[PDB]
Every structure is written in structure tokens, then in C-alpha cells.
Amino acid sequence: MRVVIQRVKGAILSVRKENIGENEKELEIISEIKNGLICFLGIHKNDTWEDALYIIRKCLNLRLWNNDNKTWDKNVKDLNYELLIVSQFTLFGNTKKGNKPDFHLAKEPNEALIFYNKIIDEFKKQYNDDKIKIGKFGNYMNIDVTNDGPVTIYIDTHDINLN
Amino acid sequence: MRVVIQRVKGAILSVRKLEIISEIKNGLICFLGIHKNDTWEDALYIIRKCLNLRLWNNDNKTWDKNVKDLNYELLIVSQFTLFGNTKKGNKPDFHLAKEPNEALIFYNKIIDEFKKQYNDDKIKIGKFGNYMNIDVTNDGPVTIYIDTHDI
Ligand SMILES: Nc1ncnc2c1ncn2[C@@H]1O[C@H](CO)[C@@H](NC(=O)[C@H](N)Cc2ccc(O)cc2)[C@H]1O
Ligand SMILES: Nc1ncnc2c1ncn2[C@@H]1O[C@H](CO)[C@@H](NC(=O)[C@H](N)Cc2ccc(O)cc2)[C@H]1O
């Protein structure tokens, strides 16, 4: 499993509508957060629940905010901050083959959706259901973000010696 | 070397005493981390990928057009947090990151090469070693990660 985590002052997420006509507004705002983390999440074809549990534990525990004087002191839960979780199969874009990315390592969409929904539910259980916001799996999205730092963290659970 | 590439409709980068120093419209924001053991060849690979990866569509083909094809812009942001050591702690420790003073000179070379491979006008950068606020419109979103030590 792969994730890019970014520290933000805020984020507004909109999604492309299913029902689109000519001469119409096509994107609709579905999620908004203030301070916290945006997590772009990619599910690998061979991911297990243990991969997901590692990512969730890490995201919730990363100490990415300063306190009064102390550097890298507080995690997202400590400050009652929010998380915006966005499904992102492009993290499996293989860029070694030339200029056209291929995404064959990404978990197949039907199982990935179920997996994604389990992950969101687990984020809500481990933290606070009011603090977890999501996009719309499988849809084009627009995200207006204020990056704070910036602070960008990348985790691939396959780089980890997980059992 | 590590990069996070995000496809954007625009980005506005500001720094403290906030003041806007860089802005782009459509293109890429590239968060770039330099490893203590990186070589010029690592840099060249990342620059090549940022400039040539086909992260936009043609009318009839997906993933067919790159940033240079569309005459779009790039915002390059130095980001040592990509070497956070999250494997070993929950507080980021940047020991795998290249020493900042030496990294700055290396980064200068990288930016020059971006400008050489593309053009001066289309490359914008942040403020190395400073706090930055970056207002971004992520388009897709489309996020690409490359670690040259993994190829
Ligand atoms: N394996 C997966 N992991 C995470 N998300 C996934 C996975 N498989 C499918 N998805 C979701 O379905 C969408 C299309 O594949 C994925 N969408 C995206 O990655 C962004 N909308 C970017 C995008 C843009 C255009 C495009 O043709 C494909 C993808 C994700 O929401
Ligand atoms: N090895 C490096 N690779 C990329 N950038 C680097 C590297 N070493 C130093 N830098 C630059 O100096 C800053 C940390 O001293 C880096 N900045 C950042 O990572 C972001 N402004 C986040 C940040 C913000 C504040 C802070 O106290 C520490 C980090 C980068 O501009």
C-alpha cells in the first residue's frame, strides 16, 4: 500500500457529476477540511489488511506539528485536526518503462473500492468519525489545498518488513 | 532521489515577511528530496521524468501528453521531508537527506538543468530552507512518486 501525506491548513474537494449535460456546472463540492492531513492512498494488488493497518497507524501517529517551542511534537489526533483521504491509483504509475505510466500493480477497482471503504471505516474507529473526510472513489476530482510547510511524507508498506 | 509530482490547475507559493514569490497556472508541482548519496545521474532521471512523463491526455488517447507538449509550467519545491525516516519513528528524522548546505548547491544545478531541458520562463521554484505556504488546485488528482534508488 502506498500513501502520500501532506500537511494542510485546509482543503476543499469537488467531484465530477455522473449526470452531465451541455452548458452545465460539472463539479460539486463534497468534502472540506481545515487544518490536518490530506492522504492520497493507493491500494496494491497484493495488499492485505496488515498493510492497511500499518498505514492507518502511521497516518494517525506522525508528529508533523510543532507545539510551543518543541519541533515535530504533535500528531493529527493531539490537535483534534482532520484527515482527507483520497483514493489514488496513480501512485502505482510505473515510470521505468518510458514516458507513458502504466498502473498494472494497482488493485483491481471492485476489490479496491471495498478495501478503500474498509480503510475509511477503520480511520473513523481508530480516531473520530467527525474528523475523517473522503473523496469519491472512481471519479475525477478537483482539490483546492493550502499546503502548510510544505510537509510531504511518503510511505510504501512493501518497503516495510511486515508480517 | 525522491520526488512527488502532482498535476495542478495552478499553484501560488508564498513565504514569510505572507508574500507571494512564485505562481503557476496549469502544470506540475514537484516536491523534491535529495538523498545524502545522490549523484547527478539520479537528478537527471528525475528531471527527465518531470518533463517527459505523459500525465495529460490527447483528444483520443489517455496519458499521451507531457508538461512540455502543452507548454505548461513547473513549480519545483525542495522537500527534505521525503526522507522522514518514518520506518524508525513517528517524529521525522532527516538523516538520510543530503546535508542542507551541500544540497543547496546540488539543487542549484538541478534548477539550471530544468531550465536547460525546457525553458527559463516555465520553471518556478520555492525558497530553499524557508517555510512556505502553497495554495494548489490538484487536478484529478494525479500524484506520481519516483525514488531513483528503486528503479
Ligand atoms: N487500486 C486503487 N487504489 C486506489 N484507488 C483506486 C484504485 N483503483 C481504482 N481507484 C480509484 O478509481 C479511480 C480510477 O481508477 C482512481 N482515481 C484516481 O486515481 C484519480 N481520479 C486520478 C485519475 C485520473 C484520470 C484517470 O483516467 C484515472 C485516474 C481512484 O479514485
Ligand atoms: N536534502 C534536501 N533535499 C531537499 N531539500 C532540502 C534538503 N536539505 C535541505 N533542504 C531545504 O531546506 C529545508 C529544511 O532545512 C527544506 N524545507 C522543507 O522540507 C519544507 N520547507 C518543510 C519544513 C518547514 C519548516 C522546517 O523547520 C523544516 C522543514 C528544503 O527547502
Author numbering:
A (entry chain A): 1 to 163
B (entry chain B): 1 to 17, 27 to 160
Sentences from the paper on this structure:
However, a freestanding enzyme D-aminoacyl-tRNA deacylase (DTD) removes D-amino acids (D-aas) mischarged on tRNAs and ensures that D-aas do not get incorporated into proteins. Mechanistically, the most remarkable challenge that DTD faces is to specifically act on multiple D-aa-tRNAs while rejecting L-aminoacyl-tRNAs (L-aa-tRNAs) without any specificity for either the amino acid or the tRNA. A mechanistically unique solution to the problem of enantioselectivity employing two carbonyl oxygens from a ‘cross-subunit’ Gly-cisPro dipeptide has been shown to be responsible for D-chirality selection and strict L-chirality rejection from the active site of DTD.
Similar post-transfer substrate analogs have been used extensively to study proofreading mechanisms in atomic details for both Class I-specific CP1 editing domains and Class II-specific editing domains.The crystal structure of PfDTD in complex with D-Tyr3AA has been solved in two different crystal forms: crystal form I at a resolution of 1.86 Å in C2 space group and crystal form II at a resolution of 2.2 Å in P21 space group. Crystal forms I and II have two and eight copies per asymmetric unit, respectively. Since all copies present a similar picture, the higher resolution crystal form I is discussed here unless otherwise mentioned. An invariant Phe137 provides base-stacking interaction to the adenine ring. The main chain nitrogen of Gly138 along with the side chain hydroxyl of Ser87 holds the 2′-OH. The α-amino group of D-tyrosine has an interaction with carbonyl oxygen of Gly149 from the cross-subunit Gly-cisPro motif. Such a capture of the carbonyl oxygen and the amino group of the incoming D-aa, automatically positions the Cβ in such a way that it makes favorable C-H…O hydrogen bond with the carbonyl oxygen of Pro150, again from the cross-subunit Gly-cisPro motif. The cis conformation of Pro150 is the key to ensuring that it cradles the chiral centre thus preventing both the amino group and the Cβ from occupying the position of Hα.
